[PDB]
């Protein structure tokens, strides 16, 4: 008598949970990832670099801009291009735009119904007017950012090799800084709402947390070193040395070990490895809540996203100030498709994103992608195990609710996991 959840609701992509139970209790938790493969890594082999660069964001809609912007860095490292200071700033800000919209989507429309009794965020519209009003303002800030700078909130054709196809008038960026700092109190509200939600003790235990170390001096999205919470730190191009993938019979996505063990990536993993690097109200909200942002609990992920919303809202007011001070900005530069190899690791909202691109004859000869949910799938399976062990004899529909609550704390985008 296995206990199956055929289609997990309120996640991105198609997935199931199946618990195998026996005499000794719960023996196995299988996350059946049925989202068909689309073979991105293979079919862009032997297509022209820009043609494939335009297609890597269809891997995922929630993290669309993370894909396009990370693949750009890798190609721009292969051909040896290097961006300019302000083009990289506005890049980080289009990315931040995707941080805010994704986080808000996930905290408010995907997670919060569980703690409120609702199967659906659509349903709680009339019982939680203030909360949803705030959801839609934060989401819609991030969606506006990606329209202005990326051309679209899903699949950002304005981010191209060498910079952007077209940059907005200066007045628009200044309005963005207005709309940003107006959102800050809404970001704080959200932190507080989520600070008061239960981190279920059944999943409390040790976790290994890997995050990209930011270059420069702040909490960020770009960098060349991957820290692990054990105290290690290894270069991003060697990601294949310290992180081993493998197929499993019940998933189209590939699991990953670090030193042969499951680990987790995402907002909490970044807060564990990198919290000293915060500033602004995020710093204090961290320093006043260190006991809520421990490495020993996946539900701490939800509150960290809220903490990140606060930070990036400030971090982006400062990044625009940098770009705004190289004004005017020629929107993009010539890029010579001289051959090369390029590896890039960024923090997508869900954790580390690794694009490895090799160019022969201005064509793509080699491509390697690993998405943060693909990293996380193994840890997720273990945390569901700990939940399902303290409740396999409870009411099934109750076991079901808490297993899925665990799954939703990772903010799984399964489509990212099977590229």
């Amino acid at each position: 008598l296995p206990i199956t959840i055929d289609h997990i609701a309120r996640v991105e992509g198609k997935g199931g949970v199946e618990i195998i139970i026996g005499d000794d209790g719960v023996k196995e938790v299988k996350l059946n990832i049925i989202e068909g493969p689309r073979f991105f890594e293979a079919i862009t082999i032997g297509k022209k670099l820009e043609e494939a660069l335009a297609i890597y964001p269809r891997i995922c809609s929630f993290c669309s801009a993370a894909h396009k912007l990370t693949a750009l860095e890798a190609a721009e490292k292969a051909v040896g291009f290097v961006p300019r200071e302000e083009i990289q700033a506005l890049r980080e800000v289009l990315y931040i735009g995707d941080m805010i919209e994704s986080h808000a989507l996930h905290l408010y429309l995907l997670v919060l119904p569980d703690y409120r009794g609702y199967s659906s965020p659509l349903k709680m519209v009339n019982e939680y007017k203030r909360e949803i009003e705030i959801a839609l303002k934060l989401k819609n800030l991030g969606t506006w950012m990606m329209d202005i700078l990326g051309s679209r909130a899903i699949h950002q054709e304005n981010a191209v090799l060498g910079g952007f196809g077209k940059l907005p008038e200066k007045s628009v960026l200044e309005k963005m800084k207005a709309e940003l700092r107006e959102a800050l109190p809404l970001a704080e509200y959200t932190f507080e709402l989520f600070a008061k939600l239960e981190q279920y003790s059944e999943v409390e235990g040790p976790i290994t947390h890997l995050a990209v170390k930011p270059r420069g001096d702040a909490y960020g999205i770009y960098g060349d070193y991957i820290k692990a919470s054990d105290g290690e730190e290894f270069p991003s191009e060697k990601y294949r040395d310290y992180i081993k993938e493998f197929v499993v019979e019940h998933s189209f996505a590939k699991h990953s070990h670090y030193k042969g063990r499951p680990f987790m990536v995402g907002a909490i993993s970044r807060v564990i490895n990198n919290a000293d690097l915060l500033y602004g109200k995020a710093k204090e909200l961290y320093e006043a809540n260190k006991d809520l942002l421990k490495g020993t609990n996946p539900f701490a992920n939800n509150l960290a996203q809220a903490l990140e919303i606060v930070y990036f809202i400030e971090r982006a007011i400062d990044l625009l100030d940098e770009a705004l001070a190289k004004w005017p900005i020629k929107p993009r530069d010539e890029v010579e498709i001289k051959d090369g190899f390029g590896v890039s690791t960024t923090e997508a909202p869900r954790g580390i994103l690794v694009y490895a691109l090799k160019v022969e004859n201005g064509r793509v000869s080699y491509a390697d992608i690993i998405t943060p949910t693909a990293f996380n799938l193994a840890m997720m399976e273990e945390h569901v195990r700990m939940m399902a062990e303290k409740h396999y004899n409870d009411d099934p529909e109750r076991l079901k609710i808490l297993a899925e609550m665990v799954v939703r704390a990772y903010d799984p985008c399964i489509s990212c996991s099977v590229h």
């Binding site: 991105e12 198609k14 049925i34 068909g36 082999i45 269809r58 659509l122 699949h155």
Partner: protein, 256 residues
């Protein structure tokens, strides 16, 4: 009664779903309707319930999605294929390489309990009653469709190229002044010429249309002047029309 609407997912980036979900007063613009299956936002959805309108997003890329679209077709009065993935098989449909070679290149020799097929649109296995175009489609492409359906009318699709929409907004033609290989002449309109509006050629995300009107004085002339072979246009069009068996003929006719 209420109009029973479901939204169902094949293999996709979920962007078409997400566009709907982000339409803000969405609840207030389907007041005639009830959403009975939509797993991405509703824990109570039921898949084998019958519906008045079925929205399907994504290409048919597994054996279970095959048997699934035959279930939706059987359980739904109107089947609406939604997005470049479900209408044309999507960007995941523009290698012609066979499944095994792709399996072998990405997974090695490993196996997986479930059965992956070659990316394929919904039209391949069941009868589709309407298509909403784009990758992702616009908010207004959903407002229009949901709008026309919920009153008893039947929606219709734009069949003229992006170029009409590009000239109306006054965008410089980057195909001409810049020689970027814009697919506007052959991509249906609807997006308000977004991409040329940012100085980037269109990659055909809303599906190939027939070039039966001389919107250029000589597209052949410009295509040759800016150095773009018939083979080069056909492959760029494959990016979103990997199964369109006319694509090859429309280009050769242009270069005639």
């Amino acid at each position: 009664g209420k109009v029973r609407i479901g939204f169902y997912a094949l293999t996709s980036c979920y962007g078409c779903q997400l566009q709907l979900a982000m339409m803000d007063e969405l609840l207030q613009l389907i007041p005639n309707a009830e959403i009975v299956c939509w797993f991405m936002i509703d824990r109570d959805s039921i898949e084998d319930e019958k519906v008045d309108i079925a929205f399907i997003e994504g290409s048919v890329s597994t054996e279970e999605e095959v048997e699934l679209v035959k279930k939706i077709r059987e359980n739904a009065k109107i089947v609406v294929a939604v997005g470049a993935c479900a209408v044309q098989g999507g960007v995941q449909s523009w290698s012609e390489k066979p499944l095994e070679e792709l399996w072998k290149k990405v997974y090695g020799d490993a196996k997986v309990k479930f059965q992956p097929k070659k990316a394929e649109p919904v039209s391949k296995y069941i009868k589709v009653d309407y298509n909403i175009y784009g990758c992702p489609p616009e908010k207004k492409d959903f407002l229009y469709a949901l709008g026309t359906f919920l009153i008893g009318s039947w929606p219709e699709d734009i069949d003229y190229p992006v170029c009409l929409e590009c000239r109306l907004n006054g965008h410089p033609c980057i195909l001409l002044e810049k020689g970027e290989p814009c697919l506007g002449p052959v991509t249906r309109a609807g997006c308000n010429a977004r991409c040329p509006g940012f100085g980037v050629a269109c990659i055909g995300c809303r599906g190939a249309i027939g070039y039966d009107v001389a919107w250029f004085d000589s597209l052949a002339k410009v295509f040759k002047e800016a150095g773009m072979t018939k083979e080069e246009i056909i492959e760029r069009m494959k990016m979103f029309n990997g199964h369109d068996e006319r694509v090859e003929k429309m280009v050769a006719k242009i270069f005639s």
